Structure 1
Amino acid sequence: VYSYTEKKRIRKDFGKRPQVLDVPYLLSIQLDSFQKFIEQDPEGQYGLEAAFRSVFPIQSYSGNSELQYVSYRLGEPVFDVQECQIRGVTYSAPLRVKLRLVIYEREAPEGTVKDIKEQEVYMGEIPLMTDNGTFVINGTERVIVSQLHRSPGVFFDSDKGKTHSSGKVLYNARIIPYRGSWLDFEFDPKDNLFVRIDRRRKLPATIILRALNYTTEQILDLFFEKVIFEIRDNKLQMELVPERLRGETASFDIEANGKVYVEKGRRITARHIRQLEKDDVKLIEVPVEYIAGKVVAKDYIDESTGELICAANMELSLDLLAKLSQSGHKRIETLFTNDLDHGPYISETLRVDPTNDRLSALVEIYRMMRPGEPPTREAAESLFENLFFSEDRYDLSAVGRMKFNRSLLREEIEGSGILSKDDIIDVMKKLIDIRNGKGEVDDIDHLGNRRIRSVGEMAENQFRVGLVRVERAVKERLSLGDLDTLMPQDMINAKPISAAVKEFFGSSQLSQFMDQNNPLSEITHKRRISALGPGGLTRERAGFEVRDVHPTHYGRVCPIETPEGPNIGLINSLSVYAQTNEYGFLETPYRKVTDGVVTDEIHYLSAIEEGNYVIAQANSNLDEEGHFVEDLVTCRSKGESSLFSRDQVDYMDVSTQQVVSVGASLIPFLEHDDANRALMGANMQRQAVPTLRADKPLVGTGMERAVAVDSGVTAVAKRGGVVQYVDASRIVIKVNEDEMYPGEAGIDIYNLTKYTRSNQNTCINQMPCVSLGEPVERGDVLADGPSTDLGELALGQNMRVAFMPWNGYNFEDSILVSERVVQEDRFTTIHIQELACVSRDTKLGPEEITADIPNVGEAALSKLDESGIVYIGAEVTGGDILVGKVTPKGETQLTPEEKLLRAIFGEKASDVKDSSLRVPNGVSGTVIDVQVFTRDGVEKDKRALEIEEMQLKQAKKDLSEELQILEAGLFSRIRAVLVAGGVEAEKLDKLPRDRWLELGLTDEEKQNQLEQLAEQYDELKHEFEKKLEAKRRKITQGDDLAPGVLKIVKVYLAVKRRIQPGDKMAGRHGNKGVISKINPIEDMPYDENGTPVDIVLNPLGVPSRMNIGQILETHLGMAAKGIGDKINAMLKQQQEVAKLREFIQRAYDLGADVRQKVDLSTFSDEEVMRLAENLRKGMPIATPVFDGAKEAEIKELLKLGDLPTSGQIRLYDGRTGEQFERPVTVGYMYMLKLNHLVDDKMHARSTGSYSLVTQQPLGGKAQFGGQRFGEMEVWALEAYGAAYTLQEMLTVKSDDVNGRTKMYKNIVDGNHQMEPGMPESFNVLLKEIRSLGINIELEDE
């Protein structure tokens, strides 16, 4: 039982495991983050509002003024997404802020206040966002990628053997802010405890204990328990608490309480404490091996004589022990020297430190930022304390204070975004204690310790700094004015926070052009996870911390949805089901136990909790009147794995695709592929492009309907009802009183895109999927887009595939395609691209634009406006004009024996340079839009003023339909309220509305329900009373183009980039390669059906690719498409309606190992038949990745294709009628054509552009350049001994103007020879060397 639009389309899952949750709308790290950056939140600590709440009220340091605040705002837009391409200006609107001022009694003592003033002011701009989760910035969808960074606070790592005079093994503690300056704590090479304040040069770690204000025995009371000795009746003894054995380098042997405890060699590292606490020990007796090397902590004396024995900070010795044996005063306080037990590094570095007090421990820090400059007393304190407590220079958020307290095992759920001058003691304790195993490293790449920084967080981090670095003239001049008579505004500049926040989405370190190759690519782009920028590193200044994998990726971040090459792992994607808590820690869905079984009481849990509860793996299985057929439940934790009994479990995974991101989640057999080709599969589906006759993945996962809606590329019934109009750009519906809101007309609208540019110059368009009078439910599909088939995804097309080598072309994932593909105009792609021109501010003001280029290429001119511009709808190719930027030439010399021809005898008209904008040599396809723009006081040019009436026609018509569509709902509600008792109301739905006022209904309140609706009507339609002009003067709008430009012009091209060789293709399972010949339908193998095969791809390569999902998609596609081919034949003869039902139902009904069923007996014998059209493409299939339709199910379903259930068939050759020495792999694969496009990249050159800087060629397609014969390319000619071919590149084909201008013409000499003159790039260098100051010249031989 399936919906009303599903009567056209239903997908067949095969999966096996107990999901009770499905796809969430994939875009949240854009969407919810954009909201919380720009939300009026009353008590939160994030976004624009929290940035202002961290700086304002600015109660001035001058004590005479205050710039107060109330809240942000956004409002007052003018551009919209259409103008944000057609014009191009970033889709943005002004940030404005509520500000105030207050002043007090200057003169009296009984009123306390005297003045109060408050307003709004401007404070910047903000880009704007679509329902589709996109943004539009300089003509293009430039979009922020989210970051995955070390969580702010502190970290604790271990440089366990780096380098230098002892390969130095280390442990550390290191500050990492959300915003700010720095501090590290570690050890020097010699092994003193050391520090790097702001990570500058070496300082002894006692300095900061003086700065934070602790004297020597306070440092002991903060970091050291204190060892105790005695001497009793006949022996030496020590005195204890039952944890004081934690590090001892035990050369020695001990008993305590009543058994042996320590023995010769067994170093008592803190692991050992679990020998002692259980045993209540408070006294021990030891060899002298633990009664020296223990530094006495006070002075001691001898009443046997009247004398001393030793002083504080002194050792013990056999003679001192002999005097202690006499003493009377038989006690000693002593220090821990055992390493990590307490770290003696403090005690000893307290005597390897020149600093003495807090002033020295701040003055020496001033030197560490200002060598050779006087340490200005008060600024020596500020320079250090403002590293951690400044208005501009430190923050953590509540998130980073939480991580700080968490990595220190605190209980304070209370604290500050700043540090404190005593929090630092615990950072130092952890370093003193860690360094051989009281603990270990802070679990860095745990995905609840590394943290997400979403789009709105990445914008927030700028406002946490810009408000405390740039406001200078405001912060200055606020001190000076008598603000009883001046205002909370009077010095605020407005230029910078426009561009600096508009283009934070268009030129920022994470805000690239979105991957608009096709819908799947933009859907995953919106949830990309960068490891880069402030919080990570780059591609270059980075190791494997930015590229590899750590097991907490499970359920959260798929390790294969990354670019390839050196870019590996630097940017990733969020798995389908994954999200984050209020700390940006990553989380996942789970099933959960009640009374004895893993119930359907589903939950979500953090990466940290995956390290704290027993999660069963997706393997496990339920039972009859019992519990589990899974006797030995396989389980998992932190990303690791185990085996347990039933009596031991808390949770389980909900699905397998919870471990998988969008591109990877469409690979139906990852059960059978290596990661190196799964990586390719996660990118080839993204490089794929819109095609003229698109067709669906027949094999599939289920994501083939989610990814059709996860960016709105298909329109969907957000309310639903009955379809009421349908048009190639427009759709409307009507609704009923079960939903219809308290005064509406009962309507929705679902209009559709048409032709514009994109970020990889792909085409954009949409088309309907419903018709007049169809009822549709709240989730039915209403339209299609650039990569769909009538209600599901189509990133490509299906083709028949032979997995065999052919006559040479297909060696290395390279692809043969049939002539039949060109006949059907298939894998032809469609593109929309833009080209432009200018007229500069001259001394008058304008510049010329026309078509005059006489006797230079006349046919490439025939296609133009009066203004020198092509027409919308005209075809253009290879060299046609687009915008008439002609330029006259000159030659001028013209003396009585130099007037050789023109200026007397012929062509006595212009010599205009071929400088007008033209179609590039290789481009072909229709002009689709044309524009002209100017400084606004000039109302717009004739070619834009005709296009005003081209755009006005659409709205002038549509609003004349809309007004009728609107009142045909609204007055139909009034008509219905009348029909409820005044049943004769069809005498009224045939009148002017004013004449309904001669009426009445019944002696009951329906009468007054009619009255109040008739009163309300004249207010309601004021909605319509604007509409047409609200598009018009966005076209006739002007914009300034900066001083230097009066006007700008554009043309757009629909480039029909056809199927051709050298272009690139792929399939879902990581097969990727060039189209390497087009083959006649018989120049190809044919099946046991007596029928040829559309594509051929080499299997000899496959064992080096280590992947087999490509074979399984091909074989399951042979069943899936074979169902549709058999339907095309069966629909003709029909045989019996129960025979149409036999095959069409059996295609769905055939299964044996499955959670789902398209049970077509739960659908009627015409729902069976409306579905048959979209089944002629083939049967659509589903399979959660790792839950899938394995080989045995393919070998069952193939009894619908009815071809050999081996998947390996007696192929023939169309040219010869032969049949090969063995059966061969065949089927039908889902395949793709990819935006590498050789079509765009035909770049050769005879001669062209030259770099004035060096007389050498320029380089670039965007420069028509010459290309680099590199140093390695020289090594080949050197190695060959090929000196003339090498010298050719070095002068007569490059910078030597003399050489290249003679060699070009040396064909006219007939003697095609070299005639070089001087390598100008060496002539350049001979004067650059002299411009540095080095003299250089020549000799002769």
Structure 2
Amino acid sequence: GTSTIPGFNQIQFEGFYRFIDQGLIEELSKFPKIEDIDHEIEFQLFVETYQLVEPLIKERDAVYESLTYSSELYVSAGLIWKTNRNMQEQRIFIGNIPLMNSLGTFIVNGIYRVVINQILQSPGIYYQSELDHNGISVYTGTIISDWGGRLELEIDKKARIWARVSRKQKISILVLSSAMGSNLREILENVCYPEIFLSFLTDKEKKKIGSKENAILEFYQQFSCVGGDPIFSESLCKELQKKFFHQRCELGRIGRRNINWRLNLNIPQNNIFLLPRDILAAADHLIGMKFGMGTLDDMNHLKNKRIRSVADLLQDQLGLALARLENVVKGTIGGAIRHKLIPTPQNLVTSTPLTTTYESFFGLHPLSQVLDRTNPLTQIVHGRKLSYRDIHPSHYGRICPIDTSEGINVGLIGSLSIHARIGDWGSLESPFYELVEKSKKAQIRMLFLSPSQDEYYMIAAGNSLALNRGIQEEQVVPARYRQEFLTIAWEEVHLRSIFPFQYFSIGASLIPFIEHNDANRALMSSNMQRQAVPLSRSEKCIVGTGLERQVALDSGVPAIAEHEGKILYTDTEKIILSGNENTLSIPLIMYQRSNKNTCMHQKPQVRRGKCIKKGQILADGAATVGGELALGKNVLVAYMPWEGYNFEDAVLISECLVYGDIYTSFHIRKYEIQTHVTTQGPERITKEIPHLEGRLLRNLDKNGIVMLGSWVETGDILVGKLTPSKETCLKLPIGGRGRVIDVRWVQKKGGSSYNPEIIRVYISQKREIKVGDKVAGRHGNKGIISKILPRQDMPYLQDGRPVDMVFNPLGVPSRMNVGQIFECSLGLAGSLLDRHYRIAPFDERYEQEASRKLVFSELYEASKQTANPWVFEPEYPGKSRIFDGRTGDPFEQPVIIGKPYILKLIMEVWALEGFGVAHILQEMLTPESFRLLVRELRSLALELNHFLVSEKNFQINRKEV
């Protein structure tokens, strides 16, 4: 990450390595030794001989059989029976630990899962000051533990300091301090304001403070709010310690560091627990804070936050799982003792505490998410998400300012920047280039800065292409310093931001000419690129940013050589590579369904006799050409209104996109069924289904499952099933026509007399582009196809070629996304010149109007080289007169034409009352709504009777409600 863009999955990869390399020991060493009531039998774990066994199955097997890709944790355990003094040691099998793929994904019950990163408040001390109802400043200081425990302090109106443990519980400072062993004498001496502390000492409080034991009882009375006088006992402290001090006063290493630096204390970094002086120091600054000495904390600063990655969560689950196993053995140890049997260390340990703790974490934890496999981009960006609304200056280079969610979570789910990295205290770090003085070695000038260090460096993003009669060091550039912007000389600059993609996420970094787009359209563009369907034929963009190749490499979608050598054999199914007397066979994915019913398919990118290095590409996956992400197509486009068929975001297209198969995609839908044992018997699969026409059963085989390669339609039975008999067959739903490409059938090998039978049918649909489909560029220009015209009806160019799509030009000025205009012109030049362009964003740093110069010069070269003068018109560059296909007359004004990259994507009652349509409203409401209301009111001993009084004879009728 110092001189290249890091691997996009690096954060997941390092985190899992830390969990295996160090995380296991920290939790396996917290497992208590288990001793019985009589202390006769003692069980212990020899942690130094812990082992991990490679999975017996392969990753593709764990998906085919819906199993879990996992490793076996083995430890040696000793069991001493003092009745016989025999120490028996065996290799105990604690359970399974799910393993992570190189792409940062887990396979749990066959489902690809990704653990996303959480951002949380870091432990430490934070000095706030909130205004009361009268506008009087009140200063508050809160201590946060490693568990999130909050020990709040405050200054009240009478200056009495209270330890607010909850909204209703208040504890005086002196009582809490004395319960921890601090006598009244030292507290006064070591605080800057002893006269303040003595001023609140009531006579009743002094007698209790005088002894440590009585202060503990006083603290318990206030903390528990229980009427009465408790009696000191060892059990009371144990209950008090877990409820309060185990949850709230265990700072940890990060909290101790933050407590020390914030409060200016020289306390060793090894002390992870709260000290009486730390509480006392918080009291001192709180007073000095009220009187103008210092600054208040900013809770939204990233230096006050910390990131919890897959290492933190997987280590918590192991710690939670080891607490269960201890009580599992405690229950089993008592049972063996009650039966006077010698228990084998094995029978004392069952695997479920470790296996079921992880299946339940992956299935239920909100940070464990099913991997989005719509396209290669969705796979790579899912693992870089950050879950918690405003942009903060500390975010720059760490959290993308654009990529956020749309709706109600906006600003609470963000993305990590491309060059970001997680540091040694859960902090996000970003790399900057250091400008060092003359006399220093300075081997590597690229350094990673945490958010705390960022404020105190002068960071410039300008360049040094400016000279006057003076000297270069005196030229001024915009820089960031202390969370603001200045203009300083170059000689005062400490650091330079030099990486082109430093400040943005992956999605924003795929938008060419992004600096010409309003920042709101760049957010909508990131979302649309995540909805792009892989096409049956793939094609590289003419114009890109250059990040497309990195996405292809990190997604895992292509096949990359794990070994150097030469290619000997390629076909549709495999590629054989041999190097250094070692031959490897690499299978190729074919027509495999993804999470969102998209089609994955690999095609070889190498031939026989071609030499390969390790890490080079072998095959192209879906939406990938030549090692580049390829989410769309380059098509001929004109920007003009066309008879209202492109009104607003509507898009008019040519029939050639349909019969050319330009935007045709494959969609594989999986239909499933299971057998269950009802009270009347087991469900059966058979072709012989009574009372059904033979036409529907024509696709079934002898066992009652649809044949391979059949052409099924809506209503056609896929699996014949009988429920003891009533028909419960797997019928194809509406809109599911297609071809059966794979049938799967297996019985789950369980311990019961009946093993459930599971059938899966995979049906492939080839979907061409249609009216109602949605398309989009990369600049937040999204459209819906409203009309498909024959090619002779389309507007056509001065070379006679009709255009493929017609976009509304009125969509650009309102949306302020000028970048699509640059891209379309440059795309046309590239196609005529047989060129592709990969342009890093913010090219204006070189010179004014850099994009205009690049686009116009390339347009002119395309016009000159191909003798196509309409391509570059000196009178109006980028635009040309085009012709109406219906009439042959030219359109009056010149029109921008180009070849952009286009992707294909995956009160009412009041209004009726305002119209006075009483009978329509009655129909749309219909009574069961009111009859059910009466019964619910009856449950509360209320009766609601509806009476009609006749206007004729005044007789009252009780309606039947």
TM-score by length of 1: 0.64
Which of 556, 570, 573 is the aligned partner of 1:729?
573
SS in 2 for 1:562: coil
Matched, 1:1283 2:930: no
Q: Distance in 2 between matches of 1:638 and 1:1073?
A: 43
The 1:1063–1:630 alpha-carbon spacing in structure 2 relative to 1, beyond 3 Å, is farther
Which of 903, 908, 923 is the aligned partner of 1:1232?
903
Q: Distance in 2 between matches of 1:29 and 1:1044?
A: 45
Range 356-365 or range 663-672, more displaced: 356-365
Paired position in structure 1 for 2:46? 69
Which of 883, 891, 912 is the aligned partner of 1:1212?
883
Q: 2:106·2:112 contact (CA, 8 Å) conserved in 1? A: yes
Say which structure, 1 or 2, has more relative contact order (CA 8 Å, 6+ apart): 1
Q: Distance in 1 between matches of 2:784 and 2:662?
A: 16
CA positional deviation for 1:842: 4.6
SS in 1 for 2:943: coil
Runs of at least 5 residues in structure 2 that lack an aligned partner in the other structure: 864-870, 950-961
Q: Distance in 1 between matches of 2:820 and 2:443?
A: 37
Which of 395, 405, 408 is the aligned partner of 1:566?
408
Q: Distance in 1 between matches of 2:121 and 2:204?
A: 33
Query: 1:1095-1114 maps to which residues of 2 (within 5 A)?
Result: 1095-1114=805-824
CA positional deviation for 1:1069: 0.8
AA partner of residue 15 (structure 2) = S
The 1:788–1:480 alpha-carbon spacing in structure 2 relative to 1, beyond 3 Å, is closer
Q: Distance in 2 between matches of 1:406 and 1:90?
A: 45
CA positional deviation for 1:181: 4.2
SS in 1 for 2:186: helix
CA positional deviation for 1:373: 7.6
Q: Distance in 1 between matches of 2:404 and 2:596?
A: 19
CA positional deviation for 1:1227: 1.1
Q: 1:127·1:505 contact (CA, 8 Å) conserved in 2? A: no
Query: 1:1014-1053 maps to which residues of 2 (within 5 A)?
Result: 1039=750, 1046-1053=756-763
CA RMSD of aligned residues (A): 3.3
Q: 1:363·1:380 contact (CA, 8 Å) conserved in 2? A: no
Percent identity between matched residues is: 39
Matched, 1:864 2:690: no
Q: Distance in 2 between matches of 1:1327 and 1:715?
A: 65
The 1:499–1:1289 alpha-carbon spacing in structure 2 relative to 1, beyond 3 Å, is farther
CA positional deviation for 1:457: 1.1
Q: 2:433·2:445 contact (CA, 8 Å) conserved in 1? A: yes
SS in 1 for 2:18: helix
AA partner of residue 113 (structure 2) = R
Q: Distance in 2 between matches of 1:69 and 1:181?
A: 33
SS in 2 for 1:402: helix
The 1:1092–1:168 alpha-carbon spacing in structure 2 relative to 1, beyond 3 Å, is farther
Q: 2:515·2:841 contact (CA, 8 Å) conserved in 1? A: no
The 1:604–1:217 alpha-carbon spacing in structure 2 relative to 1, beyond 3 Å, is same
The aligned length equals 923
AA partner of residue 70 (structure 1) = V
SS in 2 for 1:520: helix
Max radius of gyration: which structure?
A: 1
Query: 1:1025-1174 maps to which residues of 2 (within 5 A)?
Result: 1039=750, 1046-1124=756-834
Range 397-406 or range 558-567, more displaced: 397-406
Q: 2:387·2:414 contact (CA, 8 Å) conserved in 1? A: yes
Q: Distance in 2 between matches of 1:932 and 1:774?
A: 40
Q: Distance in 2 between matches of 1:857 and 1:173?
A: 78
The 1:693–1:885 alpha-carbon spacing in structure 2 relative to 1, beyond 3 Å, is same
Which of 734, 744, 749 is the aligned partner of 1:921?
734
AA partner of residue 452 (structure 1) = I
AA partner of residue 46 (structure 2) = Y
The 1:512–1:216 alpha-carbon spacing in structure 2 relative to 1, beyond 3 Å, is same
The 1:840–1:716 alpha-carbon spacing in structure 2 relative to 1, beyond 3 Å, is closer
Query: 1:918-957 maps to which residues of 2 (within 5 A)?
Result: 918-936=731-749
Query: 1:474-485 maps to which residues of 2 (within 5 A)?
Result: 474-475=329-330
CA positional deviation for 1:519: 0.7
TM-score by length of 2: 0.88
AA partner of residue 827 (structure 2) = G
CA positional deviation for 1:822: 0.4
CA positional deviation for 1:767: 0.9
The 1:173–1:53 alpha-carbon spacing in structure 2 relative to 1, beyond 3 Å, is farther
Q: 1:841·1:1045 contact (CA, 8 Å) conserved in 2? A: no
Deviations 1:685-708 (A, max 9, x none): 111111122211221111111111
Q: Distance in 1 between matches of 2:592 and 2:52?
A: 28
SS in 2 for 1:175: strand
Paired position in structure 1 for 2:486? 642
Matched, 1:423 2:301: no
AA partner of residue 918 (structure 2) = A
Paired position in structure 2 for 1:1198? 859
CA positional deviation for 1:425: 1.9
Paired position in structure 2 for 1:1182? 839
Paired position in structure 2 for 1:350? 201
Query: 1:115-130 maps to which residues of 2 (within 5 A)?
Result: 116-130=87-101
Q: 2:434·2:447 contact (CA, 8 Å) conserved in 1? A: yes
Q: Distance in 1 between matches of 2:443 and 2:818?
A: 36
AA partner of residue 126 (structure 2) = F
The 1:923–1:168 alpha-carbon spacing in structure 2 relative to 1, beyond 3 Å, is farther
AA partner of residue 54 (structure 1) = K
Q: Distance in 2 between matches of 1:130 and 1:116?
A: 40
Q: Distance in 2 between matches of 1:372 and 1:467?
A: 38
SS in 2 for 1:407: helix
Deviations 1:1055-1088 (A, max 9, x none): 3333112222111111123222222223332223
Which of 589, 592, 596 is the aligned partner of 1:753?
589
Q: Distance in 1 between matches of 2:444 and 2:351?
A: 56
The 1:25–1:352 alpha-carbon spacing in structure 2 relative to 1, beyond 3 Å, is farther
AA partner of residue 146 (structure 1) = N
Deviations 1:709-739 (A, max 9, x none): 112222233433322111112112233xxxx
The 1:920–1:449 alpha-carbon spacing in structure 2 relative to 1, beyond 3 Å, is same
Matched, 1:602 2:435: no
Matched, 1:185 2:153: yes
CA positional deviation for 1:485: 5.9
Q: 1:734·1:747 contact (CA, 8 Å) conserved in 2? A: yes
Q: Which of the two has greater strand per residue?
A: 2
Paired position in structure 1 for 2:652? 816
Which of 593, 603, 611 is the aligned partner of 1:775?
611
The 1:347–1:859 alpha-carbon spacing in structure 2 relative to 1, beyond 3 Å, is farther
Q: Distance in 1 between matches of 2:556 and 2:801?
A: 40
Q: 2:92·2:346 contact (CA, 8 Å) conserved in 1? A: yes
Deviations 1:552-581 (A, max 9, x none): 111111121222121212211111111122
SS in 1 for 2:284: helix
Which of 551, 554, 559 is the aligned partner of 2:393?
551
Q: 1:721·1:734 contact (CA, 8 Å) conserved in 2? A: yes
Paired position in structure 2 for 1:90? 68
Paired position in structure 2 for 1:236? none
SS in 2 for 1:25: coil
Deviations 1:249-276 (A, max 9, x none): xxxxxxxxxxxxxxxxxxxxxxxxxxxx
AA partner of residue 644 (structure 1) = I
Which of 685, 690, 698 is the aligned partner of 2:542?
698
The 1:777–1:445 alpha-carbon spacing in structure 2 relative to 1, beyond 3 Å, is same
Deviations 1:321-359 (A, max 9, x none): xxxxxxxxxxxxxx4xxxxxxxx3x44443498583344
AA partner of residue 708 (structure 2) = I
Q: Distance in 2 between matches of 1:769 and 1:1051?
A: 31
Q: 1:616·1:653 contact (CA, 8 Å) conserved in 2? A: yes
Q: 2:479·2:485 contact (CA, 8 Å) conserved in 1? A: yes
CA positional deviation for 1:774: 1.9
The 1:719–1:486 alpha-carbon spacing in structure 2 relative to 1, beyond 3 Å, is closer
Paired position in structure 2 for 1:592? 434
Q: Distance in 2 between matches of 1:1055 and 1:74?
A: 44
Paired position in structure 2 for 1:154? 124
The 1:98–1:1323 alpha-carbon spacing in structure 2 relative to 1, beyond 3 Å, is farther
Q: Distance in 2 between matches of 1:865 and 1:477?
A: 52
SS in 2 for 1:810: coil
The 1:374–1:885 alpha-carbon spacing in structure 2 relative to 1, beyond 3 Å, is farther
SS in 2 for 1:687: coil
Runs of at least 5 residues in structure 1 that lack an aligned partner in the other structure: 1-18, 42-46, 108-113, 227-334, 336-343, 532-546, 890-911, 937-1038, 1125-1177, 1236-1271, 1292-1318
